[PDB]
Structure formats: structure tokens, C-alpha cells
Amino acid sequence: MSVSEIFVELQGFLAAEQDIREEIRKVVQSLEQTAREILTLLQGVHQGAGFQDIPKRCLKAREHFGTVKTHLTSLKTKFPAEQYYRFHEHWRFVLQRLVFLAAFVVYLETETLVTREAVTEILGIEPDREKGFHLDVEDYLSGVLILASELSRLSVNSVTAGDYSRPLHISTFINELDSGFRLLNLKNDSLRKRYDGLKYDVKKVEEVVYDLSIRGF
Amino acid sequence: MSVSEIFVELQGFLAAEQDIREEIRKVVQSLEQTAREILTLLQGVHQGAGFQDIPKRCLKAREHFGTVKTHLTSLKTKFPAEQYYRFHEHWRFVLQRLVFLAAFVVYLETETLVTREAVTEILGIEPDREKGFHLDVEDYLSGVLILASELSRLSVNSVTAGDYSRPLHISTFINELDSGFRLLNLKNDSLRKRYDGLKYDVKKVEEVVYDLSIRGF
Amino acid sequence: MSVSEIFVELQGFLAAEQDIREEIRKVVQSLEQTAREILTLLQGVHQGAGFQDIPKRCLKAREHFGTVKTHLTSLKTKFPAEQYYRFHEHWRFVLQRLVFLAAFVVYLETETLVTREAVTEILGIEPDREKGFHLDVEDYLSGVLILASELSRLSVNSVTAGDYSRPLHISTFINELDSGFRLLNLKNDSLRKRYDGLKYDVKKVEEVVYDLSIRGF
Amino acid sequence: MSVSEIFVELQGFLAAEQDIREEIRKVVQSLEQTAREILTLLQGVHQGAGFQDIPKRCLKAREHFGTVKTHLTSLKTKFPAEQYYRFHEHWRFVLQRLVFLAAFVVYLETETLVTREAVTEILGIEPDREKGFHLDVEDYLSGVLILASELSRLSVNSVTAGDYSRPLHISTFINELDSGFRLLNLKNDSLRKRYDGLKYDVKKVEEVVYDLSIRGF
């Protein structure tokens, strides 16, 4: 093969590569839209007396995760599996949001922390040992941090709604998360930054617990 | 034409373009001053017992917008209405400030969100249909985000002023704003940036409701 | 003159300049040490769970400002008064801290804002425009901004100390500083940036007043 | 010697120098693990309700330090007891952390600041006037700064753990540290950078007491 041919072929691969980014971009936008709609179905838990609106809200959110599943399926049909971390940054943001939403729906129903692989099943993505689209560890942890912030906010609204028990559950849960994030050696600049914001969330939850205790819980 | 003749010609053009920027810059300066004066008239609502000064301060603010209309009329005189977006960056700031101030005066009076079109009327500007200095969606939304920040601060001062009802209206209002922004797919980086500060205003006001609620108010 | 003759001459001028800067550096280091001592002396106010120590602390600080005057007299000896701005950068930092400290002393004693001329008198330095070593308007305002931050901190500690009246006075004060800075059409980028921090102090002190108020007093 | 011989000889010194780094990093790796195991024990006491657990965890933390003494002894094995500052950069981080954990243990046991020499004894290394392998002022101060950050958190958890006395003591402790560093010129290193973060913790801790005294403290 000659120099001119070789570079023409290179011109080919680069053009294909760029077409992949485009298909990816279209799928991600659709994913962000669906993620916004799911957040809207859940944000409602913050308003009103009591929390009767849960599991109705969780049901609707889960049904909507159906669209996330097909789009993630479609997203996988856009690039070579081993190219994951090459294009990964295109959906970093929406994947972390999806983790948060999945974790929020699971915490609202069971008050537990969804497992990294359980998130995988909800998103229709592949487990960390099934070759395909995977759920990175830093994206999982980022989602959990967003959860924490959501939960700190929920404990305040819970009292406004007349629920003086939930805040004590959230408090315990958030202290545990903080415990774990400290037993971890996060070397990802983004994660450290995010983790740095957990203190504010832990501070907000202590004030509520305190206000409750003082008045007899 | 020689390269020299071509460039001598481009000099006149650039020189003409720079005279326009200079002209626009002086009008914008007057505009920014009138804006600071209007803000000064309104932020007085943050002190003292009660809110009996609201009507009076809103009246003085609106009268001062008369000067605003005057300067925007002159500003339109300083450039081809066709090159709006070529010189937009010069007044982007004060325009967003003016949107905030108009929205603030409308909210203080009616507790509602002024319409983009209505802001256009308060400023003596033209709606998207009248070709002549338009009010961007991006600038409108920036002004609204600045409004939310001012309102979360007002919520706190309302309680200090002895008004335990406003905080509740403000929190509902800011949550409607949050819900509204969630329907959007923001592309502008400045706006998307400012938009991330809304959740802080949402939490601040929800915390005031909480404090009021946990004390039977 | 030959190239070497020109440079041998410039070497002399540059050498004398270096010596001036070195002499300035030594006096500045002394000044910064005294400033640090005055601060330590005044920060005791944040722990004095009674605040009856104010006069004592202020008098001791003033006693120390006697040492500041001597060091500044010496500083005036190390360079040509004609070129104050050629070397201003060397003492800009400590000059601003000294403005803050003097203003912190006067506020503690009288709850008023020290005059720039009055700070000039406390430093044994000269008035404005001409006559010798001067206190720039920008160095003065930077010092005032530093004071606002210290005061927002004082408001919090005043409550812990059982004084619920001081927070109200501080809030009024910082709000007047905010109004004052509004009137200025700040051009200096450094001052402009520092001024952005004032907004945070205004809200922080207003929240303290809010806490006291919703809680009763 | 010929150029080739000079470089063949240099190749050997560099390869030996590299083998030492590989050995050092191996020991520094285990040290960092043990350090994490200790942090787990200490930070795992932040709350509960205030128990006799503090002494129990401090002793287990001390058992673990028995492991630290051994590994450091092994570390002194990997390099010439004369090229300390040459390889210092490799364990700089872990040492600072060990200083912090040591100070944390001592603070929990006696509410005192562990002396630099006492840290030397806990780590099984020698005094800064002994011989091989010391703890310089630089790394000691860094460890103390990290201590302060943990203190802000310890304080928040104590409140969420029914204990309301702890915060008052922590606040006083932090302010003494603040005054201590104030006496220092710190005309050296990023230590100055770490220091600038102490003010944050100081305010954070004072805020906790503020919350508590919002009643009768």
C-alpha cells in the first residue's frame, strides 16, 4: 500500500469515528430527556403532608425506566465494546444521573442502598462480568453522592410533611455513606470534589435530628 | 485592488465598527447606573418590620424604569437593528439585570412571574414580533434565576419582619420555577451554569418553611 | 558610549533598585509580624463569652499600633517618596490588613466605620493625594471588605456568647457597607472580586438575625 | 574515562537508585493500608451517643500502631539512613496521615495536642536530634492541619450523638491551633496552602456551637 492510500484509509476511519460520536450524541440527548422526566416523577415526594404518594411515584418512575433500557440498548449498538472508555465521557453525566435516580427509587421503597449490579439490572445494562455496557465504579459512587444530597433535602421536607421518623432513618443512612467514602481511596479528581460536598449534607441532617431530639424526637 | 488598497478599506470598516461599540458602551454605562439605582430602591424591602413599604417602593421603581426606556431607545440608535447579536454581548449583563428588576417589581406586587413579553413592555422593547431590539429567552431565564436568588433571601427577611406567610408563597413559587426549568434542555453554558445555583435557593426557602412548621407557624 | 559602557551604568542603577526593594522587604516583614500580633489580640473577642473584654482588647491593640507607626516611619526612609507606586506592591498586603485591624478596633469601640483619614492617623501615616506615604482608596476598601467578613463571623460567636443584640447591629452595618459599595462603579478587578464576597456576608448575618427572631428574641 | 564508560557507570547508580524507590513504595503501600485501618477505628467513633467506646477504639488504634512501628523499621531498611530528604517525597503523604491519626488518638484520650516528640515515640522513629529517620516540623504541622478538619466532623457527629459538650471543647481547641499557626511565619511550602483551610474548619466548628447555644450554651 502507498502513502496516499494509507492516509485515505485513515481519512475513512476518522470519518466513521466522528459519525459514531454523532449517533452517540443523539442517544445521550434522548437519555437526558428521559432522566429529566423521571426526576420530575420523583421530585414530587418533597411536597405535601405525609408520604402516601410513595409507592405511586416509585411505580411511575420504574415504568419510565423502560425507555431508559431500550435507549441504552440502542446506545450499545453504536460503538465497539472495547471503545467504551473512549466515548464514555459522552454519557458520563447522564449515567451518573441514572444511578442517582435508580438509587433514589430503591431507597424510597426499601430505605437501603441499591447495589452497583442492581443498578445495572434496572438500567438494562450489563453486570461487571457479562461483556458489554458496564457501570463504572466512579459513576456509581457519584450517583450515590447525588443521592445523599437529595436525601438531606428530603429529611427537611419530611418534617414539614409531618413525618418525624424518616429524618432519623435518613440520618443514620447518610452517616454510613460518609463512613464508607472515607474508607475509600478515591483518586478521581471529580469524585473527591463531589465527596467534599457531602459534609454540607451531613450537617443539614444533624440539625434536623437535633431539632427533633430537643422536642422529644 | 492592491493588498494596500484592500486593507485601507478594511480600516475604515473596522474604525466604523469600533465607533459603534464606543457609542453602545456609553449608553450601557448609563443603563447600568439606572439599574443600580432601581435595585437600591427595591432592596429596601429587606429591612424593617412588616412590608407596608412594598407599594411605595414598587411605585418608585416603576417610575425609574422611565429612564430605562429612554436609554434603550437611544441604544437602538447606536447600531443597525440587523446586527443585534453582533453587539449583544455589550448589554447582555444589564439586560439580564433589568429582567430581574422588572420580575422583582412584578413579584412584589402580584406574587407572579412576569412574562417575557411583559418585561419587553416595561423596558420599552419590542416583542419577538416587531423587529427591533428583542429580549432573548436566554437573557430572560438568567434574569429569572437572579429573581429566585433574591426571593430566597427575601424569604429569610420576611420572617425577621414578622411575616410568616410570604415564606410559604415564595417556597411554592421557587419550586414551580424549579419544575419549569426541568422541562428545558439548556444549551447555553452561562445559563446552564447559573441554573445549577437554583437548587441552593430551593433548599434555602424549604428550610425556612421547615423552621416555621416545626414551631407551629 | 559603547554598549558595555551603557550596561555597566545600568548595572549600577539596577543594583541600587534591588537594595531598595530588599530594605523595603525587611521592614514589611516586621510590619506583617506586628499585624499578626494585633489580630491574635483582637480575635480573642470571638471566645470572650461575655464581650466585657472589648475595651481591654482594643486598648492593647492600640498599644501595638504604636509599634506599627514606628515601623512605617522606618519604611518611609527606605525609598524615594516620589515613587510610592513603584514599590507599593511590596506593602499592599499588610497595608490592607492594617486598615482592617484599625477598622475592627474602631467598630468594636464605637460600632462605626473608621474614616480613611482616621486610619491614616492610627498608622502615623500621611493623608490623601500628596504629602508622603499615603493610603490608597483601593487599599482602604479592601480593608473594609475584610472587616465585613470578620464581622459576619463575630455575629455568629456573639450569639454563642449570649449577646443577641450585636447580630442585629452588625446586620444593619454590613447592609450599609453593601449600599455604599453599590454607589461605587468599581473598575478594579481585584476589588470587584473581593466585593462579590460581601453579598455572602450580608446573607450570613441576615440569617443569624432570622434565627434569633424566629426563635423569639 | 570515555563518554561510554561514564554513562555505563551512571546507568548503574541510577538503576540502584530506582530499585530503592521500588522498595520504598512497597513499604509505603502497606503503611497506607494500616493507616486506613486505623482511620476506620477512629472515625468509626464520631457518634453513637457518647460511649466508653472512645477508650476501646483508641487502644485498638494503638495496637495497629504497633504494626506501623514495624513497617517503618522495615522502611529504614530500604535506603541509606543518610538520604532521608532525598527519598522523603515517597512517604511524605503517609507520614502526615500517621501524624494526624496519632494526634487524633491523643486528642480523643486527653483533649490535648500531641507533641511532635510523642508522635515520634508512637511511630517508633527517632527524635529530630537522634539520627536516622525523623519527623520534621513541616510534616508535623501538616498532620495537625488534617486533625482540625477531622475535628469539624467529629463535632457535628457528637451532636447527632446526643453529646452536646464535645463541640464546645473542640471549638476552643481549634481556635488555639489557629492562634498557634498565627505565631508562625510559614514562609514556606504548600503548608501555607493547607493552613488557609484551617479558617474554614474554625468557622465550621464555631457554627456547631452556635447551633447548640441557640438554647443555653
What's the rounded Cα separation, in Å, for the pair A32 and D153?
Answer: 35
Claim to verify: residue B151 and residue B128 sit in the same structural domain: no
End residue of a domain, out of B132, B167, B202: B132
Q: Within a 10 A sphere around the Cβ of C127, how many other Cβ atoms?
A: 13
Q: Within a 10 A sphere around the Cβ of C22, how many other Cβ atoms?
A: 10
Q: Which contacts of A200-204 are long-range, i.e. CB under 8 A and separated by 24 or more positions?
A: A200/A152, A201/A148, A201/A149, A201/A151, A201/A152, A201/A174, A202/A152, A202/A174, A202/A175, A202/A178, A202/D153, A202/D156, A203/D156, A204/A152, A204/A153, A204/A155, A204/A156
Q: Which chains reach chain C with 3 or more Cβ–Cβ distances below 8 angstroms? A: B, D
Claim to verify: residue B59 and residue B149 sit in the same structural domain: no
What's the rounded Cα separation, in Å, for the pair A17 and A9?
Answer: 12
Find out whether B34 and B67 touch, Cβ atoms under 8 Å: yes
Residues in C lying within 8 Å of D, measured between beta carbons? 33, 36, 39-40, 43, 46-47, 153, 156-157, 159-160, 162, 211, 215
Q: Within a 10 A sphere around the Cβ of D107, how many other Cβ atoms?
A: 21
C178, C207, C208: best to mutate for the B interface, most B CBs within 10 A: C207
Q: Within a 10 A sphere around the Cβ of B217, how many other Cβ atoms?
A: 13
What's the rounded Cα separation, in Å, for the pair B81 and C88?
Answer: 48
Residue C52 CB-half CA count within 13 A: 2
Claim to verify: residue A117 and residue A210 sit in the same structural domain: no
Claim to verify: residue B99 and residue B148 sit in the same structural domain: no
Q: How far is the first Cα of chain C from the last one, in angstroms, to the nearest whole number? A: 82
What angle, 0 to 180 degrees and rounded to 10, lies between the N-to-C axes of helices A92-110 and A137-160? 50
- Cell numbers 462605626: residue: C112
What's the rounded Cα separation, in Å, for the pair B159 and B147?
Answer: 19
- Cell numbers 429580549: residue: B135
Q: Which three cell numbers stand for residue D111?
A: 483533649
Experimental technique behind these coordinates: X-ray
Phi-psi region of C48 (alpha: psi -120 to 50; beta: other; left: phi over 0): beta
Phi-psi region of A71 (alpha: psi -120 to 50; beta: other; left: phi over 0): alpha
What's the rounded Cα separation, in Å, for the pair B66 and B54?
Answer: 19
DSSP C102-151: HHHHHHHHHSSPPPHHHHHHHTT---SSSSSS---HHHHHHHHHHHHHHH
What's the rounded Cα separation, in Å, for the pair B25 and B18?
Answer: 10
What's the rounded Cα separation, in Å, for the pair A142 and A147?
Answer: 9
Structure resolution, Å:
2.2
Helix (H, G, I), strand (E, B) or coil at A10: helix
What's the rounded Cα separation, in Å, for the pair C206 and D188?
Answer: 38
DSSP A53-121: TTTHHHHHHHHHHHHHHHHHHHHHTTS-GGGHHHHGGGTHHHHHHHHHHHHHHHHHHHSS---HHHHHH
Per CB-CB distance under 8 Å, the chain A contacts of B209 are 160
What's the rounded Cα separation, in Å, for the pair A197 and B200?
Answer: 13
How close is the nearest chain A Cα to the Cα of B181, in Å?
10
What's the rounded Cα separation, in Å, for the pair B130 and B132?
Answer: 6
Query: How many separate helices (H) and strands (E) can be counted in chain A?
Result: 9, 0
Closest CA to B125 of B76, B64, B185: B76
What's the rounded Cα separation, in Å, for the pair B173 and B194?
Answer: 18
Give whole-number Cα distances, D48 to A11, A45, C183, D207, in Å. 64, 30, 53, 21
Claim to verify: residue C217 and residue C139 sit in the same structural domain: yes
Closest CA to A157 of B197, D160, B209, D74: B209
Q: Which chains reach chain D with 3 or more Cβ–Cβ distances below 8 angstroms? A: A, C
Look at C153 and D203 and tell me if their CB atoms are within 8 Å: yes
DSSP state of C153: H
Look at B185 and A32 and tell me if their CB atoms are within 8 Å: yes
What's the rounded Cα separation, in Å, for the pair D205 and D73?
Answer: 38
Claim to verify: residue C3 and residue C43 sit in the same structural domain: yes
Handedness of CA C138, C139, C140, C142 (dihedral sign): positive
Claim to verify: residue C151 and residue C94 sit in the same structural domain: no
What's the rounded Cα separation, in Å, for the pair B103 and B115?
Answer: 8
Look at D159 and A203 and tell me if their CB atoms are within 8 Å: no
Claim to verify: residue C30 and residue C108 sit in the same structural domain: yes
Per CB-CB distance under 8 Å, the chain A contacts of B176 are none
Torsion angle defined by CA atoms of residues B133, B138, B144 and B145, in that order, rounded to the nearest 10 degrees: -140
Helix (H, G, I), strand (E, B) or coil at B56: helix
Residue C215 CB partners (closer than 8 Å, separation 6+): D214
Per CB-CB distance under 8 Å, the chain A contacts of B189 are none
How close is the nearest chain B Cα to the Cα of A184, in Å?
28
How close is the nearest chain D Cα to the Cα of C100, in Å?
16
Find out whether D145 and D197 touch, Cβ atoms under 8 Å: yes
Residue B159 CB-half CA count within 13 A: 31
Find out whether D81 and D132 touch, Cβ atoms under 8 Å: yes
Q: Which three cell numbers stand for residue C57?
A: 482588647
Whole-angstrom Cα Rg for chain A: 21
Closest CA to A185 of C161, B170, D94, B67: D94
End residue of a domain, out of D98, D132, D166: D132
Give whole-number Cα distances, A38 to A32, A95, B152, in Å. 10, 13, 26
Look at A171 and D160 and tell me if their CB atoms are within 8 Å: yes
What's the rounded Cα separation, in Å, for the pair A10 and A3?
Answer: 11
Look at D153 and A205 and tell me if their CB atoms are within 8 Å: no
Q: Which three cell numbers stand for residue C87?
A: 514599590
Task: Specify the length of chain B in residues.
Answer: 217
Find out whether C175 and B47 touch, Cβ atoms under 8 Å: yes
Residue B9 CB partners (closer than 8 Å, separation 6+): B1
What's the rounded Cα separation, in Å, for the pair A148 and A195?
Answer: 10
Residues in A lying within 8 Å of D, measured between beta carbons? 171, 175, 179, 182-183, 185, 199, 202-203, 205-207, 209-210, 213-214
- Cell numbers 443585534: residue: B84
Phi-psi region of B113 (alpha: psi -120 to 50; beta: other; left: phi over 0): beta
DSSP B136-203: -HHHHHHHHHHHHHHHHHHHHHHHHTT-SSHHHHHHHHHHHHHHHHTT-----HHHHHHHTTHHHHHH
What's the rounded Cα separation, in Å, for the pair B4 and C66?
Answer: 68
Chains A and D touch (3+ CB pairs under 8 A): yes
Per CB-CB distance under 8 Å, the chain C contacts of B215 are 214
DSSP state of A123: T
Closest CA to C146 of C26, C35, C25, C29: C35
Give the distance from CA A52 to its chain's centroid: 24
Give the distance from CA B106 to its chain's centroid: 12
End residue of a domain, out of B132, B166, B200: B132
Claim to verify: residue B183 and residue B207 sit in the same structural domain: yes
Residue C101 CB partners (closer than 8 Å, separation 6+): C35, C38, C39, C42, C61, C65
Residue D110 belongs to domain with CATH number: 1.20.58.190
- Cell numbers 432519623: residue: A168
Task: Give the residue on B whose Cα is nearest the Cα of C179.
Answer: B40
What's the rounded Cα separation, in Å, for the pair D213 and C162?
Answer: 8
Claim to verify: residue A123 and residue A138 sit in the same structural domain: no
DSSP state of B126: P
Closest CA to A138 of A173, A89, A69: A89
Please tell me which of the candidates C183, C185, C214 has its beta carbon nearest to residue B215: C214
Which domain does B79 fall in, by range?
1-132
Q: What angle do CA B184, B186, A139 make, to 5 degrees?
A: 100
Find out whether D65 and D123 touch, Cβ atoms under 8 Å: yes
Task: Specify the length of chain C in residues.
Answer: 217
Find out whether C133 and C72 touch, Cβ atoms under 8 Å: yes
Q: Which three cell numbers stand for residue A201?
A: 449534607
How close is the nearest chain A Cα to the Cα of D126, in Å?
29
Look at C157 and D203 and tell me if their CB atoms are within 8 Å: no
What's the rounded Cα separation, in Å, for the pair D109 and D101?
Answer: 12
Closest CA to D30 of D82, D118, D98, D106: D98
Look at C210 and B156 and tell me if their CB atoms are within 8 Å: yes
What's the rounded Cα separation, in Å, for the pair B34 and B67?
Answer: 7
3-state SS track over chain D: CCHHHHHHHHHHHHHHHHHHHHHHHHHHHHHHHHHHHHHHHHHCCCCCCCCCHHHHHHHHHHHHHHHHHHHHHHHCCCCCCCCHHHHHHHCHHHHHHHHHHHHHHHHHHHCCCCCHHHHHHHCCCCCCCCCCCCCCHHHHHHHHHHHHHHHHHHHHHHHCCCCCCHHHHHHHHHHHHHHHHHHCCCCCCCHHHHHCCHHHHHHHHHHHHHHHHCCCC
Find out whether D156 and D166 touch, Cβ atoms under 8 Å: no
Residues in A lying within 8 Å of B, measured between beta carbons? 29, 32-33, 36, 39-40, 43, 46-47, 153, 156-157, 159-160, 208, 211, 215
Claim to verify: residue C143 and residue C89 sit in the same structural domain: no
Burial of A118 (0-12, 13-18, 19+ CB in 10 A): middle
Q: Which three cell numbers stand for residue C140?
A: 482602604
Per CB-CB distance under 8 Å, the chain B contacts of A156 are 203, 206-207, 210
How close is the nearest chain B Cα to the Cα of A180, in Å?
26
Residue D199 CB partners (closer than 8 Å, separation 6+): D178
Find out whether A101 and A35 touch, Cβ atoms under 8 Å: yes
Q: Which contacts of A70-74 are long-range, i.e. CB under 8 A and separated by 24 or more positions?
A: A70/A124, A71/A27, A71/A30, A71/A31, A71/A34, A72/A31, A72/A123, A72/A124, A72/A125, A72/A133, A73/A124, A74/A27
Q: Which amino acid is present at A35?
A: A
Find out whether D86 and D24 touch, Cβ atoms under 8 Å: no
- Cell numbers 414598587: residue: B58
Chains D and B touch (3+ CB pairs under 8 A): no
Q: Which three cell numbers stand for residue B12?
A: 475604515
What's the rounded Cα separation, in Å, for the pair B168 and D63?
Answer: 55
Give whole-number Cα distances, A6 to A102, A135, A152, D149, in Å. 47, 37, 58, 58
Residue B119 CB partners (closer than 8 Å, separation 6+): B98, B99, B102, B103, B125, B135, B140, B143
Find out whether B201 and B149 touch, Cβ atoms under 8 Å: yes
What's the rounded Cα separation, in Å, for the pair A32 and A47?
Answer: 24
Closest CA to A63 of A122, A116, A150: A122
Per CB-CB distance under 8 Å, the chain B contacts of C213 are 159-160
Q: How far is the first Cα of chain B from the last one, in angstroms, to the nearest whole number? A: 81
Please tell me which of the candidates B36, B46, B159 has its beta carbon nearest to residue C213: B159
How close is the nearest chain A Cα to the Cα of D124, in Å?
25
Give whole-number Cα distances, D159 to A108, B102, C160, D88, D167, in Å. 26, 45, 16, 40, 8
State the total domains in chain B: 2
Claim to verify: residue D9 and residue D101 sit in the same structural domain: yes
- Cell numbers 559602557: residue: C5
- Cell numbers 503548608: residue: D191
Q: Which three cell numbers stand for residue C2?
A: 559603547
What's the rounded Cα separation, in Å, for the pair A150 and A97?
Answer: 12
Find out whether C186 and C192 touch, Cβ atoms under 8 Å: yes
Give whole-number Cα distances, A120 to A57, A75, A103, C22, C120, in Å. 21, 15, 11, 65, 68
What's the rounded Cα separation, in Å, for the pair C154 and A154?
Answer: 32
H-type alpha helices, chain C: 3-43, 54-77, 84-87, 92-110, 116-122, 137-160, 166-183, 189-214
What's the rounded Cα separation, in Å, for the pair C129 and C210?
Answer: 43
Helix (H, G, I), strand (E, B) or coil at A22: helix
Find out whether A175 and D157 touch, Cβ atoms under 8 Å: yes
Find out whether C171 and C206 touch, Cβ atoms under 8 Å: yes
Please tell me which of the candidates C175, C185, C214 has its beta carbon nearest to residue B159: C214
Closest CA to A184 of D71, D102, D48, D40: D40
Per CB-CB distance under 8 Å, the chain C contacts of D179 are 40, 43
A31, A101, A153, A160: best to mutate for the B interface, most B CBs within 10 A: A160
What's the rounded Cα separation, in Å, for the pair A187 and B206?
Answer: 35
Give whole-number Cα distances, B165 to B48, B88, B104, B110, D174, in Å. 16, 40, 18, 14, 41
Residues in B lying within 8 Å of C, measured between beta carbons? 33, 36, 39-40, 46-47, 153, 156-157, 159-160, 208, 211-212, 215, 217
Residue C212 belongs to domain with CATH number: 1.20.58.200
How close is the nearest chain B Cα to the Cα of C145, in Å?
19
Q: Which three cell numbers stand for residue B212?
A: 416555621
Find out whether D34 and D94 touch, Cβ atoms under 8 Å: no
